[PDB]
Amino acid sequence: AEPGIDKLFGMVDSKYRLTVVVAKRAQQLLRHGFKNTVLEPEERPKMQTLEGLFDDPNAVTWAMKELLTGRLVFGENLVPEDRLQKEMERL
Amino acid sequence: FGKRKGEGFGVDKREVEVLRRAEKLGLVTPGKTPEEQLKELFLQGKVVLYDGRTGEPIEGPIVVGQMFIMKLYHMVEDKMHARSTGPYSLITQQPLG
Amino acid sequence: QKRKLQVGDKLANRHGNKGVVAKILPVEDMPHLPDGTPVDVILNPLGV
Amino acid sequence: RKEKKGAGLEFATPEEALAAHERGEVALNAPIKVAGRETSVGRLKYVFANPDEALLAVAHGIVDLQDVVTVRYMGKRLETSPGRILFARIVAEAVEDEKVAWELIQLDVPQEK
Amino acid sequence: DIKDEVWDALEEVIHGKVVLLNRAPTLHRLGIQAFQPVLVEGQSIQLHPLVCEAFNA
Amino acid sequence: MLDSKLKAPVFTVRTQGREYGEFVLEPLERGFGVTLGNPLRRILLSSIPGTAVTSVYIEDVLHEFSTIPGVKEDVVEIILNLKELVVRFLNPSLQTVTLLLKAEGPKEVKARDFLPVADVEIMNPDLHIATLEEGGRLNMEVRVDRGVGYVPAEKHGIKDRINAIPVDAVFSPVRRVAFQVEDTRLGQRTDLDKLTLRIWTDGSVTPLEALNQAVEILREHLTYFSNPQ
Amino acid sequence: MLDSKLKAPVFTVRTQGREYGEFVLEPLERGFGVTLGNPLRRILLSSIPGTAVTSVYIEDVLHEFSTIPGVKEDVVEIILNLKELVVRFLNPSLQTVTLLLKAEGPKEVKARDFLPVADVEIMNPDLHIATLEEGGRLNMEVRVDRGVGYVPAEKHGIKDRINAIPVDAVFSPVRRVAFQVEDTRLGQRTDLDKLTLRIWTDGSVTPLEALNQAVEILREHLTYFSNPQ
Amino acid sequence: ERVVRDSLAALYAEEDGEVAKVDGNRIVVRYEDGRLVEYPLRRFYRSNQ
């Protein structure tokens, strides 16, 4: 499975919020590339044959591994939404 | 079992413990020598088997025999109609080949 | 072409015990009689 | 499993009954999985310190998984079969804690669906 | 023209991906279920027995 | 060569203390995972030498199902707590060791509370044997021998005192072993075997040396076919 | 070498011909009869190298599903019959052999009709192959190779002629194996094990040679535990 | 036997006689009348299915 799904469900009220949060993080990771991560220095996912999970084998697991830390914050309206939602789609 | 004895073999210890277990399960009447106990077990159509992966016999007897098994008609039904991109229809563009 | 029995194929007896081959085991690990003869096909009693 | 009791099953009272009925099991007087009054000769004959010891003795073909016997679990003495003990251990190992596993099972009855 | 490098790449692609398995008469919500694919050598689809009742399969 | 030689099955070890050992052999050719695991498991559970508390005699005990005044634990509970005591001999010459225990006063009796002997050692000194209610007359002794596998108390009947009682012996140091064979795969083929072997041991012998003893015993047993008759 | 080697099996043999051989190992300490029998049986039935028909070429036909005029059997029947042909090598270094066959007229073509080769023998000369009635000419080449295990016809893909047709290979000299453990008595211990294993093979390898090969295979596989890391 | 006989899938001897020639695809049989008759064989005939 994934690291501590029970912890994931405990820390959100409703699951659909969890899904939209993780997927929006995944889309952000894709658009900016995997440089905009907040678990970079030591704990990074790792493949078996090589270290391929450093770059991009699966972004969803990247986002979920990110969220288990306290480095992710999500809310209904924490930032002026219009600016972000109209810069997201043109790059 | 006559062919078995012709080579000079009695009853395997695994067979012995299987017989005792079947005796505890009421399959075979107790108080009899392993010969006739195993014969009565055979009369039920069940014989001792060995697992092969472990070598230890399967606890309790197993029913074995010969069955007539036929292979059924086997067309593309098994074959994988797995496509990634194919012909589309003319009226609607829903893909069908 | 000479179709050979494999996992996808299916078998049946004359009593309708429909079935599908699920795994082909190597000869050594299949159950065998006290004599060296190994059985050919293993059937689940649950269907009876 | 249970088969038969052809001997005087009365056992709660006499402490000579342990030796006498052990002799009876030595003969064919009483089977191992017998229907004694209070206890079967299985619980008297064999007692196990840990589930590991019970299952190890099972591996040596001493006792079947369907035979009740006295086992000293985490805090108590139980008259259970090694099969039920193994079932409990399976549940407790699939999960992390064992107290929770012990409290969420019923190890006194067959595991029907 | 297949190569073992090709199958290495195929295993690389599906490391975290999932696929939806479906049964034809979809009586309820459980007739569609996602799974992690595992590449196998054969023709048939290997199915976990415990979903033998989720599907009427 | 990866087909057979470069797949000299890599032998990875995961040791969690002196009790738990996981060993993964990978990759292995088809069908050999069981062929290796099964005899190894049987050898581990059957032939590993070790020591166990063969029997015990207590001063005031006449029957094995009696109750000791001054101690809440009965004879059954006392021997049951005695079963899991593990002792390692220091030199190979030792065959049998009789160790006594004198104890009185309202205190706990544990493994470390046994009188020391130079040529034996106890890996679990804090093993709580029993409790003394109030000046409990605890005058007992245990005879401990070396053996293999598991010995029911009934058949051997080792006797030291006329009133002494037999104790079932668990000589095998390994608590239990479980081996799984899982179909691994190579780059090109899937018909390969991954052998994971998990060993739990009391602590007398580390799992590594237990496995080494097992493979050595199997190899020497194989060498029995060299001379035909 | 007496408490553990004289209380360890003498290794006797009872083999007749080169098809049937019993190997008795008596007596074993309890718990080793299966422990040795099972791995040996698995290895014998799995990884005993042998020789089997690999490719077939016919001067007349051009694919597998045709038929030769003057021949009662189809090409399918001919290949199926060839599948049971047993080939014994006399030089271990020799790997691939190409037997030739030419026949005509009312000939009940058996296995003996193959042209002799320097270091090849047919342990089953009486194996029927074909039935030529009259005016039928049968010229054929059979390429036999030494291998191990079982391989599908297309898997190996051997093509010396454009017209050649590969066949499946059954590289196992061992026909079947059955090991049985019984009880034998020794003065100190009544319940000891006697392990007798009976091997039927196809003649290419005498049972004793197969047993020695299997023992060596198991020993060298145990060798993989020698170097941990 | 009744099914294989009545469904004309096999070939049978219409009269007492002795086989003359048997090949992979044709069989010539001389009956007791002295008349020899040839029976061809569909060696590998594709079915409907």
Q: What is the 3-state secondary structure (H, E, C) of chain F?
A: CCCCCCCCCEEEEEEECCCEEEEEEEEEECCHHHHHHHHHHHHHHHCCEEEEEEEEEECCCCCCCCCCCCCCCCHHHHHHHHHCCCEEECCCCCCEEEEEEEECCCCEEEHHHCCCCCCEEECCCCCEEEECCCCCCEEEEEEEEEEECEECHHHHCCCCCCCCEECCEECCCEEEEEEEEECCCCCCCCCEEEEEEEEEECCCCCHHHHHHHHHHHHHHHHHHHCCCC
The answer to whether C29 contacts F34, with C-beta atoms less than 8 Å apart, is yes
B53 close contact with F: CB closer than 8 A: yes
Mark yes or no for CB contact F212/G221 under 8 Å: no
Please indicate if any CB of chain C lies within 8 Å of the CB of E43.
yes
Cβ contact F54:F169 at 8 Å: yes
**Residue B37 to chain F, least CA–CA distance (Å):** 28
Q: Which residues of G43-67 are buried (b: 16+ CB within 10 A; e: fewer)?
A: bbbbbbbbbbbbbbbbebbeebebb
Q: How far apart, in whole angstroms, are the C-alpha atoms of residue F194 and residue F27? A: 6
Q: List beta partners, residue G120.
A: G89
Contact G181, G198 (CB under 8 A): no
The minimum CA-CA distance between D75 and chain B, rounded to whole Å, is 33
Q: Any contact of G with H, at least 3 CB pairs below 8 A?
A: yes
Q: Does B24 touch chain D (CB under 8 A)?
A: yes
Give the pair of three-digit tokens for residue E15: 């490391």
Please give the interface size between B and D, counted as residue pairs whose CB atoms are below 8 Å apart: 5
G222, F215: Cβ pair inside 8 Å?
yes
Q: Is B17 in CB contact (< 8 Å) with chain D?
A: yes
In angstroms, the separation between the Cα of residue F39 and the nearest Cα of chain B is 9
- CA–CA separation, F175 vs F172, rounded Å? 7
- Give the Cα separation of B36 and D64 in Å (integer): 24
Phi then psi dihedrals of residue G169, to 5 deg: -115, 140
B56 Cβ under 8 Å from any chain G Cβ: yes
Q: Is G135 helix (H, G, I), strand (E, B) or coil?
A: coil
Closest partner residue to F190 among E4, E8, E41, by Cβ?
Answer: E41
Give every CB contact of residue C16 below 8 A, 6+ residues apart in sequence: none
CB nearest to B17's CB, from D1, D3, D61 = D61
Measured in angstroms, the CA of G104 and the nearest CA of chain H are apart by 14
Residue spans of alpha helices (H) in G49-197: 75-83, 153-156
Partnered with residue F145 across adjacent β-strands are F52, F96
Contact F7, F189 (CB under 8 A): no
The resolution, in angstroms to one decimal, equals 4.0
Closest CA–CA distance from residue F185 to any residue of chain C (Å): 17
Give residue A8's identity as a one-letter amino acid code.
Answer: L
F135 touches chain C (CB under 8 A): no
Method: cryo-EM
* Contacting partners of chain A (3+ CB pairs under 8 A): E
Residue C31 touches chain G, beta carbons under 8 Å: no
C40 to chain F, any CB pair closer than 8 A? The answer is no
Neighbours of C6 (CB within 10 A): 13
Q: Does B23 touch chain D (CB under 8 A)?
A: no
Chain G residue with the nearest C-alpha to that of C38: G176
**Burial label, F76 (beta-carbon count in 10 A; 0-12, 13-18, 19+):** middle
Please judge whether B13 and G41 are an interchain contact, meaning their C-beta atoms are less than 8 angstroms apart. Answer: no
**CA distance to partner chain E, nearest, from residue A60 (Å):** 8
Q: What are phi and psi of G68, to 5 degrees?
A: -90, 125
Residue F207 to residue B45: CA distance in whole angstroms? 46
- CB half-sphere exposure, A60, CA atoms < 13 A: 11
Strands G137-147 and G96-104: antiparallel
- Can you tell me which residue has the tokens 């030591």? A42
Torsion of CA F42, F44, F45, F48, to 10 degrees: 130
